[PDB]
């Protein structure tokens, strides 16, 4: 027999990590450097672009930190994209670009800078940085908050970053992590990046499956077929998505409806209930003991 390590003393001495760290959601080493503002800038907010890719969505937010909790300034979601013509593939690189662009256009519309800072209305996929215009309100500057993502080349967080810079936001970055950057030659190809932004990597995959295996094709792209999304029309679908996104980036909140009260889980038992339950258990145990005797 060996010592119980997780004994009573192991818990008397135990210190728990920050809740968000226990949950595995926040990197507090990274958060401190991202969100903390220089003390000589006082209350000047330090904005950052949050990009989180779930199993079925892309969440893009513009937040600055306060003592009580972050204040989300603007937010766009990939599940909004159907309003703009994109029905499927809401977690690919092209959707990330659309989600990011919608975030930038939505934010600039709010501050009234959309006309001033239109960004790169024509997607070339190349290094582009917006510059403030003298005599006009400065360009909105934020930073990318990649979370726990492994920020390698082609990571979709940089697709959303590319959408936001092309939307008019000022976000420091390089092209090293856009798809099309070649490590061997240390050279960046803007056409390869433009392919991913338009999803030609997805479309080229479709033709591959179609010309290689019909059954594997149906398995991999069943919902593309259902929505009548074909490899030829993909680029114009996304192009029609950008133009509509720039045309109207405003969000209209889903109208909140009253709901009849309904409790879907138990409440805590009261002290009387818990105390009685032990009383019932004790009587039942003795009652069963007396019978067997």
């Amino acid at each position: 027999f060996v010592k119980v390590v997780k004994n009573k003393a192991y818990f008397k001495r135990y210190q728990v990590k920050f809740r968000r760290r226990r949950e595995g959601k926040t990197d507090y080493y990274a958060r401190k450097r991202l969100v903390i503002q220089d003390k000589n800038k006082y209350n000047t907010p330090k904005y950052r672009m949050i990009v989180r890719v779930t199993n079925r969505d892309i969440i893009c937010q513009i937040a600055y930190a306060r003592i009580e909790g972050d204040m989300i300034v603007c937010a766009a979601y990939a599940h909004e994209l159907p309003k703009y013509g994109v029905k499927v593939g809401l977690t690919n690189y092209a959707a990330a670009y659309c989600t990011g662009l919608l975030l930038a256009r939505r934010l600039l519309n709010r501050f009234g800078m959309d006309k001033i800072y239109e960004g790169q209305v024509e997607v070339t996929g190349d290094e582009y940085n917006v510059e403030s215009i003298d005599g006009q309100p400065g360009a909105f500057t934020c930073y990318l908050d990649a979370g726990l993502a492994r920020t390698t080349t082609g990571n979709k967080v940089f697709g959303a970053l590319k959408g936001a810079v092309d939307g008019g936001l000022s976000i420091p970055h390089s092209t090293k992590r856009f798809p099309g950057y070649d490590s061997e030659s240390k050279e960046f190809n803007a056409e390869v990046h433009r392919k991913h932004i338009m999803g030609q990597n997805v479309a080229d995959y479709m033709r591959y499956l179609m010309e290689e295996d019909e059954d594997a094709y149906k398995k991999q792209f069943s919902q593309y077929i259902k929505n009548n999304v074909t490899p030829d029309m993909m680029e114009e679908m996304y192009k029609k998505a950008h133009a509509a996104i720039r045309e109207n980036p405003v969000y209209e909140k889903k109208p909140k409806r009253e709901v009849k009260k309904k409790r879907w889980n138990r409440p805590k038992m009261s002290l009387a209930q818990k105390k009685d339950r032990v009383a019932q258990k004790k009587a039942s145990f003795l009652r069963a003991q007396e019978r067997a005797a």
Partner: protein, 205 residues
């Protein structure tokens, strides 16, 4: 060999245990703190008499060893080698030093370890004897003799607890009836109304 115990009777210095900073301490004179029928169950010996210190002082491990023998011999002679259980309740942890002369004088005068002593307080128990109730007079006489091996004033006091347990003698038996006390050999375990109800089942099954 060793100095008269009057040289170290008073708790003048801070506690000086045998540790990694005090190396070379010789072994203590007292190595056995229990004797008699240590294995008696809690219920065989309801009586407990203490020798209580009236003085704040240091007792030497030689006096603890001497008293242990003195008290034990009289108990064996009057109650049998299995009619009692003695427990010396003081352990000699404080170390006393000696600055051995024959010359440097008082230069570099920090002393080497010389022995060990137990630091006892007013009201602290020095040793205890539990035996049967018809040995109340024998316990008092056993402890009265042991006092002559110690410096200062002690008092013999018959406890109201049950043997070496912390529970009052008059209410010990009922607590055992209600299974609030479960004998565990020399002493008892205390059963609170807490924790998994399964334990309560095992006790009450």
């Amino acid at each position: 060999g060793r100095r008269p115990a009057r040289c170290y009777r008073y708790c003048k210095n801070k506690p000086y245990p045998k540790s990694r900073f005090c190396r070379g301490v010789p072994d203590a004179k007292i190595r056995i703190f229990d004797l008699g029928r240590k294995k008696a169950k809690v219920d065989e010996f309801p009586l407990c008499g203490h020798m209580v210190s009236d003085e704040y002082e240091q007792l030497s491990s030689e006096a603890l060893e001497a008293a242990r023998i003195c008290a034990n011999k009289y108990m064996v002679k009057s109650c049998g080698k299995d009619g009692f259980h003695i427990r010396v309740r003081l352990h000699p942890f404080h170390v006393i030093r000696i600055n051995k002369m024959l010359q440097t004088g008082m230069r570099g005068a920090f002393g080497k370890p010389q022995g060990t002593v137990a630091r006892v307080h007013i009201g602290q128990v020095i040793m205890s004897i539990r035996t049967k109730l018809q040995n109340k007079e024998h316990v008092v006489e056993a402890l009265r003799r042991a006092k002559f091996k110690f410096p200062g004033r002690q008092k013999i006091h018959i406890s109201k607890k049950w043997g070496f347990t912390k529970f009052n003698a008059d209410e010990f038996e009922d607590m055992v009836a209600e299974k609030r006390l479960i004998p565990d050999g020399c002493g008892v375990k205390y059963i609170p109304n807490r924790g998994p109800l399964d334990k309560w089942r095992a006790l009450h099954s």
